[PDB]
Amino acid sequence: DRLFSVVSRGEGSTGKTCLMKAVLNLQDGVNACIMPLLQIDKPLVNAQCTDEFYQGHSALHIAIEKRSLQCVKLLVENGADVHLRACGRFFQKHQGTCFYFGELPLSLAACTKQWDVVTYLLENPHQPASLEATDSLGNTVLHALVMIADNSPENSALVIHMYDGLLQMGARLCPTVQLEEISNHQGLTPLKLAAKEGKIEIFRHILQREFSGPYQPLSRKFTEWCYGPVRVSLYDLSSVDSWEKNSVLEIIAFHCKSPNRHRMVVLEPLNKLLQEKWDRLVSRFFFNFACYLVYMFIFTVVAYHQPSLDQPAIPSSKATFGESMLLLGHILILLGGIYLLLGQLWYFWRRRLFIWISFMDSYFEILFLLQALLTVLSQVLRFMETEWYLPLLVLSLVLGWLNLLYYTRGFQHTGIYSVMIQKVILRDLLRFLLVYLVFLFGFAVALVSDASLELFKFTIGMGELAFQEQLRFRGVVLLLLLAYVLLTYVLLLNMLIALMSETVNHVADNSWSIWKLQKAISVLEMENGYWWCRRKKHREGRLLKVGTRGDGTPDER
Amino acid sequence: DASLELFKFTIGMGELAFQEQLRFRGVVLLLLLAYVLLTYVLLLNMLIALMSETV
C-alpha cells in the first residue's frame, strides 16, 4: 500500500493514519508531512486509535513516548487536546499490561520525568493542561504517579522528584486548587489511595511534605519551636481524623491486596500517634481482660461444680448459697455470651469478611465462630433435655481457655512473643498437623490392619503394648514399620527445626512490625467495636520533642 | 491421690489410661492431647526461641 510505505519512507482497524504511522516511526525525530494532514483534516491530531488495544490513543502520546521535542512542538500547532482519555486494552483492565501509563498526555508526560513537555504542555496557547483531569476510574494524575511506584528506590526517586516538581509547578502555574483532595471513583484521596495500595514512600512523602516558598497550606511536617539539639515536629494529622471517608488502617486492614502491609506501621505518625493513643486510653483494656478472666472463672465454676446426676437443669442441690452462685453464674455466663455474640454478629454485618473461598484469612474467627456455634448448640441442646450438652460445654470451655491467649497483645516482652507464637500459628503448625494427621491416619490404619482409641493412646510416644499375637510374625513388618516411625520421627523433628529455619529467620523485625500493627489495629478497633462516643478528633497539632542533635544550619523561614 | 497422682502422671511418663467407660474419652482427649501437643511444641518453641532471645 502507498499509505504505510509512504509513512515508512517519506489503517482503519487501528485508526492508523499516515500521520499516525508517521509518528509510529520517529526517523531522526522529524515529521514534515503535518501540513497536508492540516490540509485534509484538530480531529486528526487528537484522533483515536480504533483498535481495542489503543482505544482513544493519539500521536501526541507517542510524541511524549519518543522523548523528543520536534514532535511535541509540531503536533501542537494544529490544536492538540490535553484532556483526552486513551482507555483501551493496552491499558488499565488486566495485570501484565502497560496498566495506567496515564491515558492522558499530561499524566504520561509526567510519568517518565519529561519536564520539557510537562512544562511545554503547560505553556501551549491551544489548551492548557487540566491538572485536575481524571479518567473513568477516577484516577487523576496523582493516582497515575502513585500507581506507577514500585519497590525500587530509583523509581521512587524519579517519581518523588518529578512528583515534588509537579507540586512546584502546581504551586506556580495553577495554584489554589487542592489536587490532593481529589479522589478516585472509589472515593479515596491519593493519601487514602497511596496508603490503600501500600506505597509507604509516597504516603510518607505526603507526611514528610514541606514546601519551601509561599505559602503555608502546602507543608505537612511543621516545626514551631526551633532549637539546636532539639527538634519540635508538628503535624496536621489528617489520617485518623478522617471520620468521613475512612480510617487509614481500615484501608490497610483490608485492601486486601497488600505487598508490604506489615512494615508500614513503624513509620512515624502511625507509630507514635497510635502509641500516644495507646497510653492515653487503649491500655485500659485490662478491665475487659480481667473481666473475661473472671468470665472464664464463672464458666469454670459452673461446669466444674456440675452436680453428678442424670437430670439436666436441676434445682438447687443443695439449698445453699453456692448453688445460687451456680445458677447465678449460669444466667450470668450466657448473659455475657449474648454480649460477645452480638459483638461478633455486628462484626459480621459491619465488617463483611472472610467468605470466599479457599485460604482462610484470620484463624481467630474460625475458632470464635466454631465456639459460638457449638455453645449455642450447647444452649439449645440444653433446652432439648439431653446429656450431650456437657462435652460441648467442655469444648467451649477449653476453646475459651485458648481464647484467653488472644488478649496477650502488648507490653514490650509478652506481646511480641505473642507475635512470635501468633506468627507460628500463621505459618508452621498447619502443615505439621496436616502431615502429622496423615501419618497418624496411616499409623492407626496400620495397627488395626477399644482398638482404635487404644491405638490413639498407644502413641504420644508412650507405648508399651507389645503384641502377644504369636500368629502374625512381628519381626520384619514392625522392623521396617518402626523404621518408618524413625522416618516420621526425624522427619517431623526435621520439620520442626527446618520449620524454625523457615519462619524464625524472617520474623526478627516483622515481630517489631506486625506487633505494633496488631495493637494498632486494636487501637482503631476498640474505637470501633465499642460503639458509642467521642474519640479525640482534633487536628490542631501533635507535640513531639525530638531530641536529635542538630548542630548545622536550620535557617527556617 | 487424684491430685498428686495427676502430678505424677506427667513429667511425660503417663501410662494411666482411664478405665472409666462412662465419660467418653475420645474427642475430649483428642483435642486435649492435641492441646498437650500445643503446649509441647509451644514450650519447646519457648525454649528454643528463648535461646534466640537470650543467647
CB contact under 8 Å between A457 and B26, yes or no, is: no
CA A314, chain centre distance (Å): 51
CB contact under 8 Å between A420 and B49, yes or no, is: yes
CB contact under 8 Å between B41 and A398, yes or no, is: no
CA A48, chain centre distance (Å): 38
- The nearest CA of chain A is from the CA of B15 a distance in Å of 7
Query: Which of B31, B33, B45 faces A460 most closely, judged by CB atoms?
Result: B33
Here the contacts of A222-230 (C-beta below 8 Å, separation 24 or greater) are A222/A541, A223/A556, A224/A541, A226/A554, A226/A556, A228/A549, A228/A550, A228/A551, A228/A554, A229/A547, A229/A548, A229/A549, A229/A550, A229/A551, A230/A545, A230/A546, A230/A547, A230/A548
Elucidation method: cryo-EM
d(CA A134, CA A184): 8
Query: Which of B32, B46, B48 faces A500 most closely, judged by CB atoms?
Result: B48
CB contact under 8 Å between A456 and B30, yes or no, is: yes
d(CA A283, CA A523): 9
In the numeric block, which cell numbers belong to residue A161?
522528584
d(CA A556, CA A523): 36
The reply to whether A500 touches chain B by the CB within 8 Å rule is yes
CB count, 10 Å around CB of A93? 10
Task: Write the DSSP symbol of residue A310.
Answer: S
The reply to whether B9 touches chain A by the CB within 8 Å rule is no
Chain A contact set for B49 (CB, 8 A): 417, 420, 500, 504
Chain B contact set for A457 (CB, 8 A): 17, 29
Nearest of A373, A382, A192, A376 to residue A306 by alpha carbon: A382
A446-A449-A451 Cα angle (round to 5) = 85
Chain A contact set for B35 (CB, 8 A): 398, 402
CB count, 10 Å around CB of A417? 17
The reply to whether B16 touches chain A by the CB within 8 Å rule is no
For residues A209 and A219, the answer to whether their CB atoms sit within 8 Å is yes
Residue A235: which H helix or E strand, with range? strand A231-235
- The nearest CA of chain A is from the CA of B3 a distance in Å of 15
d(CA A226, CA A369): 54
- Find, in chain A, the residue whose alpha carbon is nearest to that of B44: A496
Q: What are phi and psi of A544, to 5 degrees?
A: -125, 125
- The nearest CA of chain A is from the CA of B49 a distance in Å of 8
Task: Please name the residues in contact with A20: beta carbons below 8 A apart, sequence gap of 6 or more.
Answer: A47, A49, A59
Strand partners, A545: A232
Under DSSP, is residue A546 helix (H, G, I), strand (E, B) or coil? strand
For residues A80 and A124, the answer to whether their CB atoms sit within 8 Å is yes
For residues A515 and A523, the answer to whether their CB atoms sit within 8 Å is no
Three-class HEC string of A418-469: HHHHHHHHHHCHHHHHHHHHHHHHHHHHHHHCCHHHHHHCCCCCCCCCCCCC
CB contact under 8 Å between B36 and A464, yes or no, is: no
Query: Count of A–B CB contacts within 8 Å?
Result: 43
d(CA A363, CA A211): 46
Q: Is A53 left (phi over 0), alpha (psi -120 to 50) or beta?
A: alpha
Task: Please name the residues in contact with B36: beta carbons below 8 A apart, sequence gap of 6 or more.
Answer: A460
Task: Write the DSSP symbol of residue A148.
Answer: T
The reply to whether B26 touches chain A by the CB within 8 Å rule is yes
- The nearest CA of chain A is from the CA of B26 a distance in Å of 7
- Give the experimental resolution in Å: 3.6
For residues A316 and A329, the answer to whether their CB atoms sit within 8 Å is no
Query: Which of A395, A432, A453 faces B25 most closely, judged by CB atoms?
Result: A453
Chain A contact set for B9 (CB, 8 A): none
Strand partners, A235: A221
For residues A229 and A551, the answer to whether their CB atoms sit within 8 Å is yes
- The nearest CA of chain B is from the CA of A417 a distance in Å of 9
d(CA A375, CA A368): 10
CB-count burial class (<10 Å; 0-12, 13-18, 19+) for A349: exposed
CB contact under 8 Å between A457 and B42, yes or no, is: no
For residues A512 and A418, the answer to whether their CB atoms sit within 8 Å is no
The reply to whether B6 touches chain A by the CB within 8 Å rule is no
Chain A contact set for B42 (CB, 8 A): 421
